[PDB]
Each structure stands twice: as structure tokens, then as C-alpha cells.
Write a protein that binds this ligand. Structure first.
Ligand code: PLP
Ligand code: PLP
Lengths: 399, 399
């Protein structure tokens, strides 16, 4: 027995699943990517409906040109931390792009969204402080909590009432950080941030909101659900990513707090990692600036999401939301065998979607998760619906 | 008072330092980068001697061509996790390049070296396990310990004797992970891995070694200090980075353990972050493959380090090592004012080096840290020495 022995049940469970010949969801390789919406998987041309490329920026000609030029002018990488030799003009320019996008006085870029959450949460709340978060918060937010030394307070998923109740029992003078997400990624529903922010401010909490899943398509300027909800002035910190709407890699946190820049000196997941390559901050900056004016993509993203949502429910699928609340649509299934047959059937017909399973989902609930892209054409959305209809009938999920 | 108030002493301490008019080491921006060894900083053409671009790969024409082509063929980013839609042919090819470089059966690429340590350490050792590490281990290794739920055992810096003593008191049946680094980055001295690995195996510990600071220039194949030390067959896991010798961004862990691939399913800093952009895995793969045959760069790196080390000690500087043990050379100073005057003097003369300060260093010790590059010419090393001589005399550090 050694340190990997604790994974023996999982390995055994996996080998037994694979022994039945079913397709492995952990072995999908994009051999070739034709566009933001199509890739070759195992020799088959496949519509991608399981990416977070919400605004189709990954093949934007300006983004790509910026990346190439940065490689020529600045090289493949910085070979240093932001706090030593790794801050190039591109890193500062990218932070300026974020300040303009969010209308904030400060922007700190991290090397991943994971690190942004891990760092912000583990640095802001220390011994004697409390972190109050939704039970179903993203793993990176939890990892922030677990890395730090604060007291953790979980409130029932999506319950303003429970948040308020839980905050009220906490000691008056303890520091409190409420961490919220704009869009809950599992089911693609949105948080009631207006109500939750008001409850949080009433108890004197500082508020950090993750807006990774609404960038470019919620709020007047595309800043996220918090802007749409009208609580921009009451949110202390907004964390996001470069790996979804922006279409590259990286994380960030924006804020108007006058002491915010001090985090560059103390935030360990910022300090003790290399800064991003010049090509990454160039592509990110160019993408971010275009996202400020991407009204056409935004409008088409919403059209796509509403069409797919309405179409799926109309043919008999049960969805995680009564209406399209975001660009994520969750199809709910009650049988594991049925869930795998449908997913595999879709894949073999040329459609890729994501899946979710217990214990990530609650017991007895199996999800197919669809995420729309601004670059899905009207015609592709109709094809997608046709594929769901065909595969759904073949597997007995719908009549 | 709020969650940032705890940083008020640091902010005040910083404003008081800056009030004296001294140059800010946390405000260096590379406005333009001319080559691996030169950049424009605040309008001045400056030789870079504070990067971890050890093998000068950042401007390699093949690396750069691979990056550009990947942008064209695969776009600016993957917009998904490795375990969903984010595994492209480039990610698999990059892992194959690592397998070839290290001669291992497995390679897992992470989005940063920070995440590779954080993930490996927090996942391998759980409740009832022990992590045994050098007191002066890298912050990312510590963060791995703090994120996880294992018992932590610090041994005195660089003490084989203390490691052995500490391991012997641990419960016989508890899982044990010894985490070691090949090169200690502060002073640039190397760990006695032959002795430490033997002590670790004698107690039945699994061994993870970080080889971020020797890649391409220690060991027959450039695999690191552990290969040089002859203990390749006894090390279970090797963690490294793409951000130093490789010249991009990313992390990895390589291993021959037959259950190693299971970590892709459970390692949270792998699962819950986007995979790297196609350009990053393309440049990394191309760089890694060239590093396998980079004898010329390696030989010149060592020549540079030995010349600089000998030259600095010969003119009167006190160094962290009696001989050049790596590509890092630490100049030891005993007065903060003198340390800042020398660093600033070098910078204003056109030389950039890194600095270290308490509490990163021990009380009363102030360092200038030089890191050689394979692309520093013989002539630049002579210029560098001339600059150290001039600035050193002006500041009274040397006669
Ligand atoms: C996607 C996401 C992350 C991770 O972002 P990466 O940049 O891919 O590491 C973190 N938090 C939330 C809420 C996310 O949605
Ligand atoms: C540089 C380094 C890291 C961090 O690597 P990044 O890829 O820059 O995050 C982690 N551990 C050690 C020992 C390092 O030297």
C-alpha cells in the first residue's frame, strides 16, 4: 500500500464502467478544431456544445494577430514572477483593459482564474474571519477557503433567507467575506445578487462576486450578473477568468478599494508563480477590448440560448431552469444508463456536450450540460435540436 | 476597519521606504524586450540578469514558429478543463514530450508550476498521512501542505541528519511524502539528494522532487539534480515548470507509478481550471524537445555561471556558495541601505538583478540574486563584471 492506494475503489469502479465498452468522458481529445463550434473527435466531425467559448473569441482574427505579434516582439514567455522581472508592458496594458471593461480603479491579473479565487479568498480572510458561501460554490472558491484559516459558513443553495439567517448569528466584530457567483454553472441559473448583496451589506460583510460565466453578456457594459442586478457600487471585489468569454488563459480580480494594490505584495498565488506569456496577455487584452463592443455576438448568444432552451423543453426534456437564465442549459435525467446512452448517442451523431454525475450533482440526478456559443449559427441550433430529438427517442428519454 | 486593514503596517512601511526616493523593486516594467538578455526599463537599455530563462528558449525560432502555427490552427485558447472539452492534440503531444524528456511512463501537465505543487501535494497526502519538507521549501510546496489535511513535518534546512531523525519518529503505517527541491533558489546551492533519497526510502516514504531550477543543465539527459545525483530509480514523482528553462507557462508532474493517471480525475488544481492555450502547449512541446539536445546551451550556461561566480568573488564580493553550484549566484550584503544602493546603482548603469530581503531571507541578510542565461555572451559576462565592479566601489561594498 502507498499514497495512491486510497484511489483503488475509484480505479476499480472506473475499470468496471469501461469494461462494458461505453465511451469514456475523460478521454475526449480534440484532434483538430475547425472553428469555435466544430472539432474532429475520434475521426468524426462534431458540433461543440460543451465549451465556455461564449463569445466565440478563440478564432477572432484580431485576437490571433495580436498573439502572433506578441510572440515576435516579446518571446514565448516572461520567465519570472510579476513582482520580479515578469511584468512586461503587455501585463500592465491587460490590467488597463480590465479597468476600462469593469470601470474600476484597480485590476490584478493572475495566471489562472483558479489562482485568482484561491489567492483572493485565502488572503482576504484570516484567523478569526468568516467566509460565507453558497453550498454549491465552485471548487476553486472552496479551495480558497480550505487553504486559508478562516471560519467557513455554508448557506443553502440560492437561499437569500438562509444567507441572512446565517450571517446574523456570526460575531459582530469578526471580519466577514461573502463569496457569491453570478451564474451557478451546474444548472446555469443566476443568483439573486440584488437581494444577497443587500443582505450582505446589512451585516457589514465585504462582498466578492465571481463573474466568470456572464462576461460580455450580462449588464449594460457586459460586466456580469452583478451589473445587471444593479449592485455594482456595493460589491467590493469581482473575480473573473480569461479562459471563457475572453478565450485564452488567466484570472483577475477588479476593485475600487484604495488599498487593493497591496495584494500584489502578499497574495501568494500571485507572487509565487510566473506571469503569463506575452502572447496570452496580448490576446486577452485584445479580446477584452472587443468584448466591450460585442453587441452583435451578445444578442446572438442570447437568441441561441433561448431557442435551444425552448426547443429542448418543447420536445419533452426536463431542464434545470424554467427559462434560459444564462448560456448554460442543463438537461436532467434520472437513470445513469439512460444518461450515458444519450450522451454517447449524441457524440456518435456528431454532438459534444458535457455531463455531470453524483457526487458532483445530488444523489439520483444526472445532467447533460449544454453551453451556447455566440458563433453557433441559427442552422446549427436547429441541427442540435434535431440531434437531441433523434437520440432522445432512440434512448426512450422522450416520446 | 475591513479585511485589508491588516496590511496597514506593510502599506505604511512601504510608503516610508518610497518617500526616501529609492527605486521600487516591485515597479519594474519591461517596456520592450530586445532579446533573452536585454530589455528597455524606464527608458534605459538594460542587461537582464534576473530571469529564469536559463536556456534562452524564449526567442528560439522553432519555438516561436510553433506558437504562431498553433494560434492559426487551434485558436487563442481551449475554453475548457482537461477533463471535459479542453484536451487537444497539443496537450497530449506535450505530455508525450515530457515522457520522452524524463524517460517516464506518465506525464500530467498543469496550467502552472504553482498548481502542479499545490495539486500533487494536496492530493497525494490526506488525513493521517505526513508531508516531510525542508523548512525553507518554496511557497507553492507550503501552500500544497496548507491546502491538504496531512500532518506537516519540517526538517532543518539542508540537514540529512535532521530529516532522518524526524522520519524515524513518525508512525510506521502512516503514509509519508518527502518533498525535496534539487536546487535551493535563494542561494543557488544544491540539495544532497543522494543522501536524502536514501534516508527517505529507508523509512518507506514516497519521494517527490521539484526540478524547476535545473532543467536542461543537470544530469546526463538534463532531467535535474536528482538525475545528476543518481537517484532517478528511487524518486516516485518529479514536479517541474514550463516557465523557466522551457520559456512559457505551465507545470507538470512525471512518474512511472502505474496508478498515476488516476490523478487526472481527482486532483482539484488540475480538474477545476482551463487547460493551457494551444500556443502554450505547442511552444512548450517544441522547447522541451530541443532541450533534450541542447548540449551547447548547457555548456555555455555553466561557463557563464562559473565565470561570473569566480569574477565576483575575486573582486571582493561575498557569495552564497564557495563555487558555482547552479545558474543562480547570490551576493550577500549585511546592510539594507548598501543593498538598495548597489541594486539601484546596477540598475541605473544598465544591469537588472533580483533582490531578496527579510523575512524571505534570514534576519540581517540581504541578497542580490543573479541568474545566468545560456544566451549571455562571453562579452556580456565581462560587461556584467565591469558593472558590479564600478557600482560596488561607488557604494563601498568592495575596495
Ligand atoms: C471557470 C471558473 C474558475 C476557473 O477559471 P480558470 O481560469 O479556468 O482557472 C474559477 N471560478 C469560477 C466561478 C469559474 O467559473
Ligand atoms: C518556480 C517554481 C514554482 C512555480 O512555477 P510556475 O510555473 O512559475 O508557477 C513552483 N515550485 C518551485 C520549486 C519553483 O521553483
Amino acid at each position: 500500500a502507498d499514497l495512491l492506494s486510497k484511489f483503488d475503489p475509484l480505479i476499480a469502479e472506473r475499470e468496471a464502467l469501461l469494461a462494458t465498452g461505453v465511451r469514456d468522458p475523460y478521454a475526449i481529445v480534440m484532434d483538430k478544431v475547425l472553428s469555435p463550434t466544430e472539432a474532429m473527435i475520434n475521426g468524426r466531425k462534431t458540433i461543440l456544445l460543451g465549451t465556455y467559448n461564449y463569445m466565440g473569441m478563440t478564432f477572432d482574427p484580431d485576437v490571433i494577430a495580436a498573439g502572433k505579434q506578441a510572440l515576435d516582439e516579446f518571446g514565448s514567455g516572461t520567465t519570472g514572477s510579476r513582482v520580479l522581472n515578469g511584468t512586461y508592458q503587455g501585463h500592465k496594458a491587460c490590467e488597463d483593459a480590465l479597468k476600462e471593461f469593469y470601470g474600476t480603479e484597480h485590476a490584478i491579473v493572475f495566471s489562472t482564474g483558479y489562482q485568482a479565487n484561491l489567492g483572493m479568498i485565502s488572503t482576504l480572510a484570516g484567523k478569526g474571519d468568516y467566509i460565507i458561501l453558497d453550498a454549491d460554490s465552485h471548487a476553486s472558491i472552496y479551495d480558497g477557503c480550505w487553504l486559508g484559516d478562516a471560519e467557513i459558513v455554508r448557506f443553502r443553495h440560492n437561499s437569500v433567507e438562509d444567507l441572512d439567517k446565517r450571517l446574523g448569528r456570526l460575531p459582530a466584530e469578526a471580519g466577514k467575506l461573502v463569496v457569491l457567483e453570478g451564474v451557478y454553472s451546474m444548472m446555469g441559473d443566476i443568483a439573486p445578487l440584488q437581494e444577497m448583496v443587500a443582505v450582505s451589506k446589512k451585516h457589514g460583510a465585504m462582498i466578492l462576486v465571481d463573474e466568470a460565466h456572464g462576461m460580455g453578456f450580462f449588464g449594460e457594459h457586459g460586466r456580469g450578473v452583478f451589473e445587471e442586478a444593479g449592485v455594482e457600487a456595493d460589491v467590493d471585489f469581482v473575480v473573473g477568468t480569461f479562459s471563457k468569454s475572453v478565450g485564452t488563459v488567466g484570472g483577475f480580480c477588479v476593485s475600487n478599494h484604495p488599498k487593493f494594490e497591496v495584494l500584489r505584495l502578499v497574495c501568494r498565488p500571485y507572487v509565487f508563480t510566473a506571469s503569463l506569456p506575452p502572447s496570452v496577455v496580448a490576446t486577452a487584452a485584445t479580446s477584452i477590448r472587443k468584448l466591450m463592443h460585442a453587441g452583435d455576438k451578445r444578442a446572438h448568444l442570447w437568441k441561441n440560448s433561448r431557442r435551444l432552451h425552448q426547443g429542448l423543453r418543447d420536445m419533452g426534456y426536463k431542464l434545470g431552469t424554467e427559462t434560459a437564465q444564462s448560456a448554460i442549459i442543463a438537461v436532467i435525467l434520472t437513470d445513469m444508463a439512460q444518461a450515458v446512452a444519450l450522451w454517447q448517442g449524441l457524440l456518435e451523431a456528431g454532438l459534444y456536450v458535457n455531463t455531470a454525475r453524483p457526487p458532483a450533482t445530488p444523489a439520483g440526478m444526472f445532467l447533460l450540460r449544454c453551453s451556447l456559443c455566440a458563433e453557433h449559427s441559427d442552422e446549427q441550433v436547429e441541427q442540435i435540436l434535431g440531434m437531441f430529438e433523434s437520440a432522445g427517442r432512440a434512448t426512450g428519454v422522450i416520446p
